[PDB]
PDB file of C-alpha atoms in Angstrom:
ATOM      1  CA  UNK R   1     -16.739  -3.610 -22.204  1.00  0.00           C
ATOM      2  CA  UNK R   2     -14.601  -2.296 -18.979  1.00  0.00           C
ATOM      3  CA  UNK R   3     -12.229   0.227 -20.539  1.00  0.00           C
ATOM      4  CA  UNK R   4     -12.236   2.245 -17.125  1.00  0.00           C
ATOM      5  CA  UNK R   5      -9.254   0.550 -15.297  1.00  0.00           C
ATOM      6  CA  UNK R   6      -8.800   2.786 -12.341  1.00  0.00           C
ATOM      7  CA  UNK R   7     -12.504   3.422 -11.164  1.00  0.00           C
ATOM      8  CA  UNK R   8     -11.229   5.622  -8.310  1.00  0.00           C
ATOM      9  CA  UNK R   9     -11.701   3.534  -4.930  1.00  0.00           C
ATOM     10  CA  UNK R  10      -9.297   1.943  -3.262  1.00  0.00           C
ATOM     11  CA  UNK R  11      -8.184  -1.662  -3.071  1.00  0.00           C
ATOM     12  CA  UNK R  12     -10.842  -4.229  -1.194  1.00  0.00           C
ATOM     13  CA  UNK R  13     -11.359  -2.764   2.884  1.00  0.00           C
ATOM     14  CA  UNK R  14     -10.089  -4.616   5.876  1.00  0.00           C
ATOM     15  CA  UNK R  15     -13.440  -5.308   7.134  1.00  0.00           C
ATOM     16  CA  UNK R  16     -14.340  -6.754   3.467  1.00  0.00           C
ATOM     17  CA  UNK R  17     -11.312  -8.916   3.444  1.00  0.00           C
TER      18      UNK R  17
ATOM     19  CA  UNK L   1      22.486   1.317  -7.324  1.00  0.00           C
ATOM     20  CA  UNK L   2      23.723   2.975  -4.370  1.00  0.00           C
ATOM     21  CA  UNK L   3      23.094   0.640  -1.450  1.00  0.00           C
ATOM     22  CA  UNK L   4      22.310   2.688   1.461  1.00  0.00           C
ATOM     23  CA  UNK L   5      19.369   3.365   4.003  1.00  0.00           C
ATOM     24  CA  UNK L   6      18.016   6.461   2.818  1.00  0.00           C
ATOM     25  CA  UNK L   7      14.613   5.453   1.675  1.00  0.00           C
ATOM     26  CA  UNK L   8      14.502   1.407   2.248  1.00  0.00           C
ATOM     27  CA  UNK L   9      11.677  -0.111   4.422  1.00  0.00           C
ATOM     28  CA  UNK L  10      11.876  -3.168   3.184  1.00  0.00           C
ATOM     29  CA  UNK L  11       8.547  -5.632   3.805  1.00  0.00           C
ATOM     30  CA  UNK L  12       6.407  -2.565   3.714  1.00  0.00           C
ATOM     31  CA  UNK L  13       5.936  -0.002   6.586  1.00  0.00           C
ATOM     32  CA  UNK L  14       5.276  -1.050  10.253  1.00  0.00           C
ATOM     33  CA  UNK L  15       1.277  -2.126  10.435  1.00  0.00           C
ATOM     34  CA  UNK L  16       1.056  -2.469   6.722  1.00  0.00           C
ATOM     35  CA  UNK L  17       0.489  -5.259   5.058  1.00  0.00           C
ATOM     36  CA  UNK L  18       1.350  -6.373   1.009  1.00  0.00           C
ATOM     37  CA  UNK L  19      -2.367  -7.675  -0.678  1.00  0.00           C
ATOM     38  CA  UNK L  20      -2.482  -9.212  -3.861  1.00  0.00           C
ATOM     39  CA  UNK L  21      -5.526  -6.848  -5.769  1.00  0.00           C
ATOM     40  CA  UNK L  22      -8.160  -8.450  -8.107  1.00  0.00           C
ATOM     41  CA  UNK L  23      -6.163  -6.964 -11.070  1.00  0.00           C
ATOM     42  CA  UNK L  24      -2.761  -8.496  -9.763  1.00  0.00           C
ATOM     43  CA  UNK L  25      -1.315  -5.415  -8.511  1.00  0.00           C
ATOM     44  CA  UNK L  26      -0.398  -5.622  -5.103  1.00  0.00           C
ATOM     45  CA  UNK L  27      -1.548  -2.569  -3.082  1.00  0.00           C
ATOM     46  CA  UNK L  28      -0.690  -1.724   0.743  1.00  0.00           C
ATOM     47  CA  UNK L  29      -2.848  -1.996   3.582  1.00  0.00           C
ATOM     48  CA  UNK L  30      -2.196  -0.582   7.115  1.00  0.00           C
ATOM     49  CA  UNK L  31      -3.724  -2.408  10.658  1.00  0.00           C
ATOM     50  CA  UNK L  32      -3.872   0.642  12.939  1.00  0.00           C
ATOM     51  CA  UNK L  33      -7.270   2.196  11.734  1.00  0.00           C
ATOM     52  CA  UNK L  34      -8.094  -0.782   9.175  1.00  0.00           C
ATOM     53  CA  UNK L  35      -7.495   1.816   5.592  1.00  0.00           C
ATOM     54  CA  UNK L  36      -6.215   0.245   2.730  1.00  0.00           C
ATOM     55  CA  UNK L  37      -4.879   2.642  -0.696  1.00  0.00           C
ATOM     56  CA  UNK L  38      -3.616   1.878  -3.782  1.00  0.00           C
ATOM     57  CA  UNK L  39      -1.008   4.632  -3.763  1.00  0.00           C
ATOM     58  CA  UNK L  40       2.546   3.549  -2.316  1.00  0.00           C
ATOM     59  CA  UNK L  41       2.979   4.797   1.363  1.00  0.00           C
ATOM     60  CA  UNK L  42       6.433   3.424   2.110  1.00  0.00           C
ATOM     61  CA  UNK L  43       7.644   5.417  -0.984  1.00  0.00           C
ATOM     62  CA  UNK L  44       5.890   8.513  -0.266  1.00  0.00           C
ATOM     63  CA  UNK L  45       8.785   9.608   2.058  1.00  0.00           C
ATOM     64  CA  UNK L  46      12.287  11.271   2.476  1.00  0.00           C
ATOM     65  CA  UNK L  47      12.894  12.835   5.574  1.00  0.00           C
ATOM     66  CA  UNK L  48      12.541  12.098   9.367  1.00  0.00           C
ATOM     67  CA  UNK L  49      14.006  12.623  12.758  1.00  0.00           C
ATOM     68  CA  UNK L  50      16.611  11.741  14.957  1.00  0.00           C
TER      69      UNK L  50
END
């Protein structure tokens, strides 16, 4: 049950990666 | 078509980086101020100075 594919934010932060 | 260097970079801009996303798409990511965006910066361009 996704249907939303583009949520809005961007791709996974540098600090995240 | 039409090999020339009018809008080429190449291996992404200078700082940037080419990450594989979650979904497979591969987005851009740039080192100066750690900001990553899903839009293409390297594309989003055609003029400059010299």
């Amino acid at each position: 049950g996704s249907t939303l594919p583009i949520p809005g934010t961007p791709p996974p932060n540098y600090d995240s990666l | 078509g039409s090999p020339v260097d009018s809008n080429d970079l190449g291996p992404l801009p200078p700082g940037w980086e080419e990450r594989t996303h979650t979904d497979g798409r591969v987005f851009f990511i740039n080192h100066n101020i750690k900001k990553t965006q899903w839009e293409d910066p390297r594309m989003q361009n055609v003029a400059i100075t010299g």
